[PDB]
């Protein structure tokens, strides 16, 4: 059965934007691949190199001052924010999905102001720390620094930091 | 397991009698507007959808509610109509369905009799996977697999090997 | 609650264009980021470098001579202009937003003249000084020269000019 | 009040194309800017370098021979043309706008001839001299050679030609 | 008054394609310009260098064998063709426009064959010689080799071939 | 009179796909031109260099196994196929057009499988040998190797292979 | 007769996603061609070099945790999955097509979450091993490493690995 | 071999009498709603399609089912209507056709007589390749091909060679 | 064999981790000082090993890593100690470590052009004396210039020409 | 002739297949040490063959191929043995093998810059002594520097100038 989303909440630093957050986009997680064909092969296999960058793009529709003031701070990973969502499928079992993130709010975009429409500001955060819990337990935990790429509890770079001494 | 239209008709009647005590009578195919605050559910149209990959036929049904009221109580029927719309935002009717999509609510002119003049059509759509899934490809259970080797091959001597065996 | 904008005023040098300014676009403020992955990390963190350039694009619909005459001046930051706006939300509490800016009016674009439509000239100012006050108090104060990037009162480059002697 | 254009006339060499000139586009005037961030600054200021090129694109809808014959001449600035327009706003005060220009007619474009439609030839002149008078008096006077960039009467390169001896 | 085209005829080598030539496109004639700003100037003047290439694109809708057989010939300027047209404006005075051309038929494009539509083959000729007579007398006569760029009778490269000895 | 196509047949190796071949695209034949302006000329003439590559793109709508099995063969020009068509114009005189080709089937593209639509696989053959007979006799015969570019019977590279000894 | 698809099943590791997999895209198989024209030829023949990379893009519409947990694993070719399909044509003879694949799940894309629609996550697997059986028997068997490009049973690189010693 | 419209009318009547025992009478052009649970098939419209490359004319016919029922048994006719929709997901009617495309199902107002008031239109489309294929180009069988050489050429002496010959 | 590439990297200097700012390393190019040799009775020279040459091991950082600037031009040459770690993950999961212990003179601090909006990239270089590369903990290279240690894969390749010079 | 290019490649070192990590090879550039010669009674010099020069056969891998790092700078020069296989498939199917047996000194291990997100590319080089290229199993080149063997296509091109030096 498909999962229709029902509830949406966004935090920035604890302040409830429950309500006026009409659109939100979590970062697409992309493995840095490379089409690799060596000697004894014809089709290229693809090899991980890590992830690429992570941009999350929510778009609030007010002159906020509670989300505007996290643009251009002297420290990255100061804007954090916590998303909360609720997909509802399979006989009312609404699974609680949260997606808490962290990083530099890299772009604040006020749209066209044609004197009578809504506000619809646009935002984009260059996510460093990204933590996605679907139904309580962990799914994606991506800390770029310290190399803590962890899938559903197990750390996929546990074998790497022992080799690198981290 | 899977849903039935009669399972859908019983649960929409069931929940709407709990939430609306001002609605005296919410029947799924009644007639005869016998008293003032009556609500008569209907079926408008059942339409196709993106067919899933199993034997279920995806159908979204334009469900329809008609709020029968004598004229002069138009505001008393919008308060009934606002009770139905506030239900339909998350409502799956406790039946393994998708949440219902609210469509419109307005006063209409029925083809039927107009002694109870004022009626408010409240219609909404919700998808249905009616029927059983159907398997088509392969029906070979875990009890049947034997895995021999190259010298132990042929109709003379059978490959004497089961997949659950020693450790 | 969302904020529907209600009133719009644009100044150029004090002259009230209240009325015929149908479209206006404030500069999107973009941090100059860089996808940075060093040794002990897999996903790239993004590091500020400052801001990128700021273009504000309003489009008046008359042959003005009060906005046309600020094109191609021998000095940049001579065109300044002051925007005034009014978002109205949360029980008639119309928040007064102003966005005063400054810079070279870098492009004057007359559209197609198909003999019978409106004028709809188009403009673009390469904003140097940008000051956004939402509800009286400061939000964004971006002075590029002298390095005065200030968020809601505090100067985020106060630690930088002490290091550089400015 | 907005200004709806009412009358349109185009000259080429004096010959009245009043009537069949359905579309006309004056050159967008663009300052040659450059995103300049030096040492003591974070956001880039933009500095003029002069203007960029100027193309005016009118599109007559006949086999002319009075506008076709100015293509590919051995001298540039031989095609000149004078536009005349009339925006009408603010209680019938029709402001007379003229935009006389000059330059090489750099492209003559006959469209598709699908045997039954109009002609709609297309033209493009690489404007050298450009003179825009809105309501009698001068607005934009752009002579590229001799450096005579003049805004509403004053010559913005008067300080430059004294330095260069021109 | 605008000029609605009425009659269309295309020749290839004399064979009358009067009728089934639904679309035809004469070559757009483009001066090879160059945005030239030298020392004592700010905006770039544009200087001719000659013309650029000339493609004429007609699209007949049959399996011809009378236009197909001029593809890929061992000699360029073997396909010539003569267009004939007739714009009708100003009290039935149908001006006879002809556009005779010449060059390599550089592309024959059969479209999608979805089993039941028309044919609509497509063609493209890299025009060398191009001669456009509007109302009997000459307008554009472009011979690339020998440098015979001639506008309405006068040869604009008469001063060039005396310098080059041609 | 235009030529509406009526019948369509495709062979692969003799197997009749008469019926389910909804779309088919013959290779557009393009002369490898080059805008060539030498000394004594202004507009660039275009010179043949040969043809460019030839892709034919048919799209059958079934899981075939009679066209799928010609992908990725160890020899090019193993997939050949013969198209047969029939344009009908000029009083029922249906001209028989065939277009037999040959080359590597360079791409097999199964589309989106959204569980309920048609199949619509897509194909693309890098055509080497291409032979187009319109109404019995030859039009285009393009053999790339051995240089046998032949137009309506005569070989346009007969003068070339005598010079090259082929 | 065309083949309308009827049934669709996707496995990931055995877990039946029969049902909620609305869209699925098998990898387009593309020969790495090269337009090759040597000395004695005019049109370029195309030569195989092997295949290019293979991306399969299915898009489930739930917060899965049974497909999400195969992103970013430390080993490629750990996500495998088995597709099952059923085209139905020619008097109810539903041909069983399966397409089992294997490779790194290179991208997990959650869409816009506009608070009330479906989920529609998007996925992309950089397929290494690809095996397509149409009606029981083999069609495409592409193992990139070990060079096992096999078409309908026969290995097209059997002559290559004898030369390379693999 | 190829299909006929009379072959289509017989098979849709044939299968629907097996799956629907509550439907008393499924005729392809009946009238006279003589009893309660009747279903009257129809033809709404036959439309063109993408013409295949042979002599068949591609046609998709809006087939149409009308479920006649006396009023007061509206729910008893949706259960008939749900039986038709669950059929049409994979159904080719055993006739070398494409599977039928379900379109809609709703209560309508007929032009005909309304003694049996309540009717439910159930319409669906399915493509048809009616007619024979037609060959046009060349009719030269394998029995006729002789392949001579350069000296064995001319109307004087015939090219004495068959294509099936020795090994 | 498995496809195996470089993924991540690390640098230590006297124990101090550079876990945050190393964009690039460079292991020292081990090359034999080949003197091509054609003599009487042959052609196409045969390239006798004469020994190695100098081993500069460049790297770069783009912060104020003062803990890396303190080792430039000290009185004790070969007092810059440091490892060039790096893991090769392969395709089948577990990563193969490559570490490279260095001991040399930091002979170059090359601060980049400061274009005020780009990176810094303090490019360095160490003319190392001692050099020990490991793969999965297994030894491959011991290169000690003084006291004559060239031990390829643990077995000393100069020991036969060290007990004759009497070292 | 048929259009025939390189498609795939392989590398062996002492029997060990590098079937997984070789992005590039380089066969040794066979070049004659041409000494241009203009003398009395001519012009436009005539380029007498003097012999070959040194034959470095570079290649690169991007994993921790320690089985290729063990052969750097050993005591036995010309102990690196290895073949540079490669098949040319042509256009008409069957592939023509090209193998190249080597025997030389691994005189260079050049580890690339480790930019932490790119490949590794351990570029190598072998100044080979012995060199034997084959095409479809047929001999073309025997290049042995010492003991004077230059055998082009099986026939020895230095045998006339080896039985006069008395080798």
From TrEMBL, chains B, H:
Domain of life: Bacteria
Region: Disordered, residue numbers: 141-167
Protein name: Phage protein
Organism listed in the record: Pseudomonas aeruginosa (strain ATCC 15692 / DSM 22644 / CIP 104116 / JCM 14847 / LMG 12228 / 1C / PRS 101 / PAO1)
Taxonomic placement: Bacteria, Pseudomonadati, Pseudomonadota, Gammaproteobacteria, Pseudomonadales
UniProtKB/TrEMBL annotation, chains I, J:
Signal sequence annotation: none
NCBIfam families reported in the protein's UniProt record: tail_tube (TIGR01611)
Species the sequence originates in: Pseudomonas aeruginosa (strain ATCC 15692 / DSM 22644 / CIP 104116 / JCM 14847 / LMG 12228 / 1C / PRS 101 / PAO1)
Lineage: Bacteria, Pseudomonadati, Pseudomonadota, Gammaproteobacteria, Pseudomonadales
InterPro entries: Tail_sheath_structural (IPR052042), Tail_tube (IPR006498)
Protein name: Probable bacteriophage protein
């Amino acid at each position: 059965i498909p999962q229709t989303l029902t509830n949406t909440n966004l935090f920035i630093d604890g302040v409830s934007f429950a309500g006026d957050v009409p659109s939100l986009t979590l970062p697409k997680l992309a493995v840095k691949t490379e089409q690799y064909r060596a000697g004894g092969m014809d089709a290229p296999v693809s090899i991980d190199m890590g992830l690429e960058a992570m941009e999350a793009k929510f778009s609030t529709n007010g002159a906020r001052r509670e989300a505007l003031n996290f643009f251009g701070l002297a420290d990255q990973s100061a804007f954090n924010g916590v998303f909360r969502g609720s997909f509802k499928g399979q006989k009312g079992a609404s699974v609680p999905v949260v997606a808490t993130l962290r990083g530099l709010l890299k772009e604040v975009d006020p749209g066209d102001w044609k004197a009578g429409e809504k506000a619809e500001f646009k935002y984009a955060v260059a996510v460093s720390y990204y933590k996605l819990e679907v139904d309580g337990r962990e799914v994606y935990e991506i800390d770029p620094v310290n190399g803590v790429r962890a899938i559903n509890g197990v750390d996929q770079l546990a074998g790497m930091r022992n080799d690198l001494g981290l | 397991q899977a849903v039935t239209l009669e399972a859908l008709y019983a649960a929409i009647e069931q929940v709407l009698r709990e939430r609306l005590p001002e609605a005296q009578l919410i029947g799924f195919w009644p007639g005869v507007p016998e008293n003032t605050p009556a609500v008569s559910l209907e079926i408008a149209e059942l339409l196709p959808e993106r067919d899933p990959g199993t034997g279920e036929s995806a159908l979204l049904c334009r469900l329809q509610a008609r709020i029968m009221v004598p004229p002069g109580a138009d505001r008393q029927a919008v308060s009934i109509a606002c009770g139905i719309v506030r239900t339909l935002r998350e409502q799956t009717w406790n039946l393994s369905l998708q949440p219902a999509r609210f469509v419109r609510s307005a006063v209409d002119g029925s083809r039927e009799e107009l002694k109870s003049l004022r009626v408010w059509l409240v219609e909404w759509t919700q998808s249905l996977r009616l029927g059983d899934p159907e398997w088509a490809w392969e029906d070979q259970p875990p009890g049947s697999l034997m895995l021999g080797f190259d010298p132990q091959t042929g109709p003379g001597h059978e490959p004497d090997y089961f997949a659950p065996e020693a450790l």
